[PDB]
Symmetry: C2
Subunit: 165 residues, 2 copies
């Protein structure tokens, strides 16, 4: 396990995500604990981080998160991020487009930024981003959004599945 700038950037994003999640819970923004037949078993090991919730004595994955460390640009204007098309196609297959998030840390703005698999496909339909060859979606940082999006999804899908059971 050799150090790289990319791996360090990933742990940086993970750290910032954990802090946010903790602060949301403490401030009362989220009213439930998140944890870091088995539902969505095929999504196991597909994404970097899975956010679970307690059903009873079982755990249910609510959101799946992919950590994006280094950008396509900052390894030598606006920062551009490359996101694997396979990650988005998997979210489509398992009908979880709004629950699959990609996250990066913007240094200049000093803030975590997110985008859903749903929104990536939406930007493709609008011809704002395109797939290109392993295919990658090239997504400028302005199309990414702050973690408020993730927080709203977290609460909404929690309420949906709390009702589903």
């Amino acid at each position: 396990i050799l150090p790289t700038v990319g791996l360090g950037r990933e742990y940086l994003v993970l750290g910032k995500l954990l802090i946010s999640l903790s602060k949301w819970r403490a401030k009362g923004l989220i009213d439930f604990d998140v944890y870091l037949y088995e539902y969505y078993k095929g999504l196991e090991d597909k994404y970097d981080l899975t956010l679970y919730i307690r059903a009873k004595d079982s755990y249910y994955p609510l959101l799946w998160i992919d950590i994006t460390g280094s950008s396509w640009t900052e390894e030598q204007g606006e920062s551009i991020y490359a996101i694997l098309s396979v990650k988005v196609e998997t979210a489509k297959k398992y009908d979880v487009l709004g629950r699959v998030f990609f996250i990066h840390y913007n240094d200049t703005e000093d803030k975590l930024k997110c985008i859903s698999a749903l929104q990536i496909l939406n930007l493709e339909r609008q011809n704002k981003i395109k797939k290109d060859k392993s295919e990658y979606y090239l997504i400028p940082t302005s199309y990414w959004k702050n973690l408020t999006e993730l927080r709203i999804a977290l609460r909404g899908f929690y309420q949906s599945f709390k009702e589903y059971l």
Copy 2:
């Protein structure tokens, strides 16, 4: 089995990330000329393996040798100056195994936007000079160390190179 997010754990990964970036930049810029290998939590210092948060190894053929051990660890309005508490046992262990200069404590300074460090050796030296104090809160002793006594990662870099050359 399932862990709950905490601000403390988030800060640890943040420090770990910053450390990995720094180590990588030193290697890329030629500030270190050898490969370092991390591991979170005859083989030398096997008793120290579970004692600290991170261990930096170097590749000795197919074996790994630990060069340094690293521990990851508002305050101004409360105490007048920013102070960090380090468990006394962590320093006692460094003394016991005679690795005082190879055991480092690290925190992320948010205002300065930099990682700060101090060695177990430096802590004991400050204690002898009566510059810092040990103290019990409630047992488990703690060294109370103001941020000004901490130093930038250049200290750690010099140690890394020096001890690499020593054991090579």
